Scaffold this active site. Structure first.
Site, PDB file in Angstrom:
ATOM      1  N   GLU B 160       0.818  -1.196   0.000  1.00 38.79           N
ATOM      2  CA  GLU B 160       0.000   0.000   0.000  1.00 38.79           C
ATOM      3  C   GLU B 160       0.859   1.256   0.000  1.00 38.79           C
ATOM      4  OE1 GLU B 160      -3.210   0.472  -0.756  1.00 38.79           O
ATOM      5  OE2 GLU B 160      -2.443   2.546  -0.859  1.00 38.79           O
ATOM      6  N   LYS B 219       8.938  -2.027  -2.419  1.00 40.16           N
ATOM      7  CA  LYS B 219       8.313  -1.158  -1.392  1.00 40.16           C
ATOM      8  C   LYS B 219       9.323  -0.897  -0.291  1.00 40.16           C
ATOM      9  CE  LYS B 219       4.221   0.905   0.138  1.00 40.16           C
ATOM     10  NZ  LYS B 219       4.510   1.797   1.335  1.00 40.16           N
ATOM     11  N   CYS B 275       5.855   3.734   9.273  1.00 41.22           N
ATOM     12  CA  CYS B 275       6.464   3.129   8.074  1.00 41.22           C
ATOM     13  C   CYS B 275       7.984   3.254   8.024  1.00 41.22           C
ATOM     14  CB  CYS B 275       5.883   3.697   6.782  1.00 41.22           C
ATOM     15  SG  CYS B 275       6.727   3.038   5.302  1.00 41.22           S
TER      16      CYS B 275
HETATM   17  N1  LIG Z   1       2.114  -3.576  14.584  1.00 38.39           N
HETATM   18  C1  LIG Z   1       2.904  -2.522  14.739  1.00 38.39           C
HETATM   19  O1  LIG Z   1       3.259  -2.120  15.851  1.00 38.39           O
HETATM   20  C2  LIG Z   1       3.398  -1.838  13.433  1.00 38.39           C
HETATM   21  C3  LIG Z   1       4.346  -0.637  13.621  1.00 38.39           C
HETATM   22  C4  LIG Z   1       4.766  -0.063  12.417  1.00 38.39           C
HETATM   23  C5  LIG Z   1       4.372  -0.499  11.142  1.00 38.39           C
HETATM   24  N2  LIG Z   1       3.526  -1.611  10.950  1.00 38.39           N
HETATM   25  C6  LIG Z   1       3.177  -1.962   9.530  1.00 38.39           C
HETATM   26  O2  LIG Z   1       2.091  -1.090   9.028  1.00 38.39           O
HETATM   27  C7  LIG Z   1       1.267  -1.838   8.063  1.00 38.39           C
HETATM   28  C8  LIG Z   1      -0.148  -2.070   8.634  1.00 38.39           C
HETATM   29  O3  LIG Z   1      -0.613  -0.825   9.056  1.00 38.39           O
HETATM   30  P1  LIG Z   1      -1.887  -0.536   9.931  1.00 38.39           P
HETATM   31  O4  LIG Z   1      -1.715   1.025  10.353  1.00 38.39           O
HETATM   32  O5  LIG Z   1      -3.195  -0.597   9.216  1.00 38.39           O
HETATM   33  O6  LIG Z   1      -1.824  -1.387  11.269  1.00 38.39           O
HETATM   34  P2  LIG Z   1      -2.906  -1.123  12.487  1.00 38.39           P
HETATM   35  O7  LIG Z   1      -2.148  -1.492  13.722  1.00 38.39           O
HETATM   36  O8  LIG Z   1      -3.473   0.415  12.558  1.00 38.39           O
HETATM   37  O9  LIG Z   1      -4.107  -2.041  12.123  1.00 38.39           O
HETATM   38  C9  LIG Z   1      -3.881  -3.459  12.310  1.00 38.39           C
HETATM   39  C10 LIG Z   1      -5.194  -4.133  12.627  1.00 38.39           C
HETATM   40  O10 LIG Z   1      -4.909  -5.518  12.520  1.00 38.39           O
HETATM   41  C11 LIG Z   1      -5.721  -6.140  13.543  1.00 38.39           C
HETATM   42  N3  LIG Z   1      -5.160  -7.490  13.613  1.00 38.39           N
HETATM   43  C12 LIG Z   1      -3.885  -7.823  13.804  1.00 38.39           C
HETATM   44  N4  LIG Z   1      -3.773  -9.156  13.762  1.00 38.39           N
HETATM   45  C13 LIG Z   1      -4.984  -9.673  13.535  1.00 38.39           C
HETATM   46  C14 LIG Z   1      -5.493 -10.964  13.389  1.00 38.39           C
HETATM   47  N5  LIG Z   1      -4.692 -12.008  13.489  1.00 38.39           N
HETATM   48  N6  LIG Z   1      -6.796 -11.147  13.131  1.00 38.39           N
HETATM   49  C15 LIG Z   1      -7.611 -10.111  13.035  1.00 38.39           C
HETATM   50  N7  LIG Z   1      -7.174  -8.857  13.182  1.00 38.39           N
HETATM   51  C16 LIG Z   1      -5.868  -8.609  13.425  1.00 38.39           C
HETATM   52  C17 LIG Z   1      -5.464  -5.273  14.758  1.00 38.39           C
HETATM   53  O11 LIG Z   1      -6.433  -5.533  15.797  1.00 38.39           O
HETATM   54  C18 LIG Z   1      -5.589  -3.879  14.090  1.00 38.39           C
HETATM   55  O12 LIG Z   1      -6.923  -3.355  14.075  1.00 38.39           O
HETATM   56  C19 LIG Z   1       2.053  -3.104   7.897  1.00 38.39           C
HETATM   57  O13 LIG Z   1       3.125  -2.769   7.016  1.00 38.39           O
HETATM   58  C20 LIG Z   1       2.569  -3.325   9.318  1.00 38.39           C
HETATM   59  O14 LIG Z   1       3.587  -4.319   9.361  1.00 38.39           O
HETATM   60  C21 LIG Z   1       3.021  -2.272  12.131  1.00 38.39           C
HETATM   61  O1  LIG Z   2       9.232  16.731   3.356  1.00 36.72           O
HETATM   62  C1  LIG Z   2       8.901  15.990   4.288  1.00 36.72           C
HETATM   63  C2  LIG Z   2       8.054  14.902   4.055  1.00 36.72           C
HETATM   64  C3  LIG Z   2       7.644  14.089   5.104  1.00 36.72           C
HETATM   65  N1  LIG Z   2       8.092  14.352   6.386  1.00 36.72           N
HETATM   66  C4  LIG Z   2       7.725  13.476   7.528  1.00 36.72           C
HETATM   67  O2  LIG Z   2       7.926  12.111   7.141  1.00 36.72           O
HETATM   68  C5  LIG Z   2       7.031  11.278   7.915  1.00 36.72           C
HETATM   69  C6  LIG Z   2       6.270  10.417   6.883  1.00 36.72           C
HETATM   70  O3  LIG Z   2       5.289  11.210   6.259  1.00 36.72           O
HETATM   71  P1  LIG Z   2       4.446  10.729   4.952  1.00 36.72           P
HETATM   72  O4  LIG Z   2       3.844  11.911   4.290  1.00 36.72           O
HETATM   73  O5  LIG Z   2       5.383   9.995   3.842  1.00 36.72           O
HETATM   74  O6  LIG Z   2       3.330   9.783   5.623  1.00 36.72           O
HETATM   75  P2  LIG Z   2       3.366   8.172   5.838  1.00 36.72           P
HETATM   76  O7  LIG Z   2       4.372   7.721   6.875  1.00 36.72           O
HETATM   77  O8  LIG Z   2       1.874   8.066   6.276  1.00 36.72           O
HETATM   78  O9  LIG Z   2       3.495   7.540   4.429  1.00 36.72           O
HETATM   79  C7  LIG Z   2       4.743   6.958   4.155  1.00 36.72           C
HETATM   80  O10 LIG Z   2       4.593   5.626   4.657  1.00 36.72           O
HETATM   81  C8  LIG Z   2       3.481   4.985   4.053  1.00 36.72           C
HETATM   82  C9  LIG Z   2       3.857   4.806   2.588  1.00 36.72           C
HETATM   83  O11 LIG Z   2       2.973   3.838   1.933  1.00 36.72           O
HETATM   84  C10 LIG Z   2       3.867   6.197   1.936  1.00 36.72           C
HETATM   85  O12 LIG Z   2       4.103   6.166   0.499  1.00 36.72           O
HETATM   86  C11 LIG Z   2       4.946   7.026   2.653  1.00 36.72           C
HETATM   87  O13 LIG Z   2       4.841   8.376   2.246  1.00 36.72           O
HETATM   88  C12 LIG Z   2       6.125  12.226   8.646  1.00 36.72           C
HETATM   89  O14 LIG Z   2       6.706  12.260   9.934  1.00 36.72           O
HETATM   90  C13 LIG Z   2       6.269  13.565   7.892  1.00 36.72           C
HETATM   91  O15 LIG Z   2       6.053  14.764   8.696  1.00 36.72           O
HETATM   92  C14 LIG Z   2       8.976  15.452   6.635  1.00 36.72           C
HETATM   93  O16 LIG Z   2       9.408  15.699   7.763  1.00 36.72           O
HETATM   94  N2  LIG Z   2       9.356  16.281   5.579  1.00 36.72           N
END
Ligand SMILES: NC(=O)c1ccc[n+]([C@@H]2O[C@H](COP(=O)([O-])OP(=O)(O)OC[C@H]3O[C@@H](n4cnc5c(N)ncnc54)[C@H](O)[C@@H]3O)[C@@H](O)[C@H]2O)c1
Ligand SMILES: O=c1ccn([C@@H]2O[C@H](COP(=O)(O)OP(=O)(O)O[C@H]3OC[C@@H](O)[C@H](O)[C@H]3O)[C@@H](O)[C@H]2O)c(=O)[nH]1
Ligand SMILES: NC(=O)c1ccc[n+]([C@@H]2O[C@H](COP(=O)([O-])OP(=O)(O)OC[C@H]3O[C@@H](n4cnc5c(N)ncnc54)[C@H](O)[C@@H]3O)[C@@H](O)[C@H]2O)c1
Ligand SMILES: NC(=O)c1ccc[n+]([C@@H]2O[C@H](COP(=O)([O-])OP(=O)(O)OC[C@H]3O[C@@H](n4cnc5c(N)ncnc54)[C@H](O)[C@@H]3O)[C@@H](O)[C@H]2O)c1
Ligand SMILES: O=c1ccn([C@@H]2O[C@H](COP(=O)(O)OP(=O)(O)O[C@H]3OC[C@@H](O)[C@H](O)[C@H]3O)[C@@H](O)[C@H]2O)c(=O)[nH]1
Ligand SMILES: O=c1ccn([C@@H]2O[C@H](COP(=O)(O)OP(=O)(O)O[C@H]3OC[C@@H](O)[C@H](O)[C@H]3O)[C@@H](O)[C@H]2O)c(=O)[nH]1
EC number: 1.1.1.22
Lengths: 457, 457, 164
Positions: B160, B219, B275
């Site tokens: 994504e 990605k 991310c």
């Molecule tokens: N988990 C973390 O602490 C964490 C931290 C940074 C990045 N990420 C990454 O971000 C992306 C996902 O983003 P997101 O913001 O939507 O995550 P999110 O935490 O906002 O949403 C995850 C959802 O998954 C649900 N879930 C997890 N395991 C499940 C299961 N086995 N069955 C049913 N539900 C389940 C949770 O209850 C939650 O609502 C992935 O790349 C993930 O690896 C995760």
């Molecule tokens: O010019 C910039 C751009 C971004 N940032 C910071 O960088 C961090 C990431 O910001 P983003 O706008 O990229 O937001 P996100 O973390 O939600 O998205 C990022 O991770 C998800 C990916 O799928 C997106 O393509 C990537 O942009 C934030 O803390 C933002 O404030 C800066 O400090 N300066």
């Protein structure tokens, strides 16, 4: 205030091209390019220009003797000029503090002293270089110490963004022109005077104005952003080779993000050129001098990656040729640091040639624009025994164990490889350090070429 | 051939809005979004959504009930579905090999198992996340090992690209859609079936299709490139501070070079978000494992820079308060990692708060979207002793020595700074961590503030 | 310009004996030593002083209540003063940056604030300690940023060399 005469000290890859385009776009203004190097000046005045650059012959031959002049008479050109460009080279210090890292400013300095010697009244002096490293400040130091009554020398900074190979098209349509000058009434009047030169063909919104420092920083930084992009993608090419992916496909994928842009993402054996290494090296050196060691080590990675990428490729070559080259004829296709130029400064080709030469290879080097005397200087008795400079490429691969493509010259894509495969030893290897032979891959395997290329296992 | 029912496991920042958008553009398709977290499902169905995201309310209300659903009934949705998205968190490992660096697939693995216990016949299963680390492989490994006759599950990778705060816009016109599946006749039919979905609102030119590993590396790499730029511009912001330049000006001049682009050059107290940091950590980890320490080393700097930018910013605040901040009241404006979301994951605001709490500061935090009880959780005696969650920004700046802007909420640009001033202790500092008060500089000085800001002086 | 009223914020090993002696040597000068520590002030006004220092008791008793005073009334002491000494302590920070190493300037900052608050017209303010660490600079910062009309505060450094 009105610039009528321009002098440019430095008739090199920056000054020759830039001055020619100013002459061409400012027919009212007399444009004199000067240099201590007489064979260089003679060439500029000849049917055979001293550097290779698409479109340059046309532009010159259109202005030369009309409003464009190449002379060794530095003193009279300075004396008559309203604007004086300084566009000379700054080699890396070869000893002392900053040895191998810091740029040597001895020529900037001799230019400013020469300018004070030969000047009266009002002149604008402008430093234009690809890598400006405390240039403007240095000039100022000298002007400030050597005054005369009614001598009014004003110092500006005007960094050059052109890339060699596309100089003419870059100078005629820059993404932007950057100009710094003092935040003083006098500074501001000199800045305008230069904008008006550029305003003959550059629209006002593309010209940026600032102080000398900021201008030099912007240049140091941008050059650095550019080399980062290449090291960055080159690091992903290694990773691609380790895991069975194609960096050209990954790069396509990265590139479509309009926040990353798709440019400068072609992996390669390594970036070369007078610009990039020396830029980063000076950026680092400066950061250390300002006690910013975290910023220093951040940028250093740009150079360390590029050293790795070169090395990986050299040793990957030797491994495919059964861990020894200690008597084999290898072809080097491309000596220049990039296509469409005969410049070799800091070229990746110099480093692969050399590593293979430490290892016992007999090299046959072909480039379409680099003079053969230049290839001999760049390699340093060993040259006697191992190196041979070839006249065409098919002469270079006759007898050969492998072809090593170091430079993305378009002619290399259009070779008849079946003819090549015939007279090559077998099994026949091609090491494509530039990705110039994408898509033709299977066809060459069909012929029986075993092909190795950056970012693809 | 054709997808009519979609299940999405995970109703987070990724699963929630992306399925909402599929629903809206694809009325002929029944989309069900499921989660273990009843509380989160309830809100997805309430008039107040569990996350803040511009346009998201209107997209959900546009087709919840009709072809868009949220429920805690995981089994039934899996069962009736042609396509099952996994969009779950992968927390960093807390123990074992690579404790504190590698992602933990323990939720992704639980998901795949639950899919087999609820599936017969054909199902396309698609991994969809911002940072995917070996995700496709670990779904596949589980499908291979839970073999039932007549069960044909195909695994696709569908990273994504959306950025929080801009999700709906990004979802509705993305720069590209990346879908990877096995290059078998069977993988191709499942890839094509996934294309056919997006093909409802995205031109085919912009839909890229590869294998699954090349999908994930793409990605991994791209996210890192985006992070590199911010770290790169942040490194320059320290340089500008140490020499009298202004990073906003340096960035304009850098960005006008079309080969670099002008996006992602806004210097800041440091990137957060769930991310980037984890994406680099993982990439580092992967390279260490694959015996590519040069590359590991290379990308690690993106993080070290970010850490140092955070630290440098904190330490300036403390300096200005003449190295003592015991009982001094300080306002923290902005807690989200970036404007237009309530998300605090890896937010720079946390990290500043922590360095100010170690100095014993009385912190007063305001953020218009972050839930009060989430700020408290992030900063965890010490919290109950030093932290107040403010209701509005003005009571946060009442009795305060310093105002620290950590998130670029547009509202901050038009606070009543006169009123805030009157009630601050003097001298009164605004530390603009985001360059959000730019150009407003003259008015603030005049009022009587000391304005420090990133990459200027 | 002549100093005729001196106030000293800080009745410690520095503030106390320094002010006692200025009083001994200059009979036409009124010297008022202030401190938040009530106990330490009463002891200065008692036949048992809060610190032992050979020969100190004789000095104090030769001018206390004559041209030397001790008091918890900081506000009025500053108000009527020509010169204000700052003679407080700067303990070592116990957390954060410079923990275990740097001086905590919080009591100097609190004296500067209080001085501005209780001041009008012209006064000279003199930092006096055995270890001055960016003290005068820090006083100046507070004063510069808390302007009043016709308040003119002059900031000086007068380090103390005595050994206890
Ligand atoms: N988990 C973390 O602490 C964490 C931290 C940074 C990045 N990420 C990454 O971000 C992306 C996902 O983003 P997101 O913001 O939507 O995550 P999110 O935490 O906002 O949403 C995850 C959802 O998954 C649900 N879930 C997890 N395991 C499940 C299961 N086995 N069955 C049913 N539900 C389940 C949770 O209850 C939650 O609502 C992935 O790349 C993930 O690896 C995760
Ligand atoms: O010019 C910039 C751009 C971004 N940032 C910071 O960088 C961090 C990431 O910001 P983003 O706008 O990229 O937001 P996100 O973390 O939600 O998205 C990022 O991770 C998800 C990916 O799928 C997106 O393509 C990537 O942009 C934030 O803390 C933002 O404030 C800066 O400090 N300066
Ligand atoms: N010399 C290097 O290795 C080097 C490397 C990186 C960057 N740079 C910088 O970036 C730009 C690269 O310049 P270039 O590619 O055109 O280099 P160049 O070598 O091709 O041309 C420089 C010209 O300046 C002439 N020159 C030097 N000193 C002179 C003097 N005192 N009087 C008269 N003429 C003199 C030289 O003879 C040469 O013809 C320069 O503007 C420089 O400041 C130089
Ligand atoms: N006193 C300490 O414990 C201490 C510790 C480390 C360093 N120092 C530093 O080294 C030297 C010691 O000075 P001293 O030995 O005379 O110290 P001291 O502690 O014996 O005297 C300091 C007096 O100032 C008073 N004081 C502090 N803040 C005040 C305020 N805001 N208003 C009114 N009174 C206040 C305190 O109560 C204390 O009585 C000082 O000159 C200073 O440079 C002192
Ligand atoms: O994607 C890329 C781009 C460039 N390169 C290599 O990077 C090196 C630099 O190539 P450039 O296109 O930047 O050419 P230059 O060195 O002439 O120009 C560079 O320095 C001077 C500045 O004015 C230019 O703006 C800057 O591009 C060459 O070795 C080139 O082959 C890559 O290997 N991959
Ligand atoms: O020869 C000596 C002298 C002194 N010392 C010790 O060094 C320490 C300091 O003794 P001092 O004589 O300097 O007494 P102080 O510390 O009160 O004064 C010291 O600090 C404050 C400054 O204003 C004085 O100028 C300075 O002498 C004591 O512990 C003393 O016993 C020695 O061990 N050997």
């Amino acid at each position: 205030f009105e610039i009528k005469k321009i002098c440019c000290i430095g008739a090199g890859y920056v000054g020759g091209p830039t001055c020619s385009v100013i002459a061409h776009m400012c027919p009212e203004i007399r444009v004199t390019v000067v240099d201590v190097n007489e064979s260089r000046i003679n060439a500029w005045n000849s049917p055979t220009l001293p550097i290779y650059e698409p479109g340059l012959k046309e532009v010159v031959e259109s202005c030369r003797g009309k409003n464009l002049f190449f002379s060794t008479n530095i003193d009279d050109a300075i004396k008559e000029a309203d604007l004086v460009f300084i566009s000379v080279n700054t080699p890396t210090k070869t000893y002392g503090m900053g040895k191998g890292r810091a740029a040597d400013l001895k020529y900037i300095e001799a230019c400013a002293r020469r300018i004070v010697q030969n000047s009266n009244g009002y002149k604008i002096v402008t430093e234009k270089s690809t890598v400006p490293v405390r240039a403007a400040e240095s000039i100022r130091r000298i002007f400030d110490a050597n005054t005369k009554p009614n001598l009014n020398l004003q110092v500006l900074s005007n960094p050059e963004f052109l890339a060699e190979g596309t100089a003419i098209k870059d100078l005629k349509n820059p993404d932007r022109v950057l100009i710094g000058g003092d935040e003083t009434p006098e500074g501001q009047r000199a800045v305008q005077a230069l904008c008006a030169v550029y305003e003959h063909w550059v629209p006002r919104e593309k010209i940026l104005t600032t102080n000398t420092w900021s201008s030099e920083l912007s240049k140091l930084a941008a050059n650095a952003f550019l080399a980062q992009r290449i090291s960055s993608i080159n690091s992903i090419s290694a990773l691609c080779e380790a895991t069975g992916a194609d960096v050209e496909e990954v790069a396509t994928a990265i590139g479509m993000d309009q926040r990353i842009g798709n440019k400068f993402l072609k992996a390669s054996v390594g970036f070369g050129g007078s610009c990039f290494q020396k830029d980063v090296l000076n950026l680092v050196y400066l950061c250390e001098a300002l006690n910013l060691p975290e910023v220093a080590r951040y940028w250093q990675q740009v150079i360390d990656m590029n050293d790795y990428q070169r090395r990986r490729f050299a040793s990957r070559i030797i491994d495919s040729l059964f861990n020894t080259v200690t008597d084999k004829k290898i072809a080097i296709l491309g000596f220049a640091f990039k296509k469409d130029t005969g410049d070799t400064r800091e070229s990746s080709s110099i480093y692969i040639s050399k590593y293979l030469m430490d290892e016992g290879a007999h090299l046959h080097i072909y480039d379409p624009k680099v003079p053969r005397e230049q290839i001999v200087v760049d390699l340093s008795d060993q040259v006697s025994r191992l190196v041979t400079i070839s006249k065409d490429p098919y002469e270079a691969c006759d007898g050969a164990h492998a072809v090593v493509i170091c430079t993305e010259w378009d002619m290399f894509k259009e070779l008849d490889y079946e003819r090549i495969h015939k007279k090559m030893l077998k099994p026949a290897f091609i090491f494509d350090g530039r990705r110039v032979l994408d898509g033709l891959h299977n066809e060459l395997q069909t012929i029986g070429f075993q092909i190795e290329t950056i970012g693809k296992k």
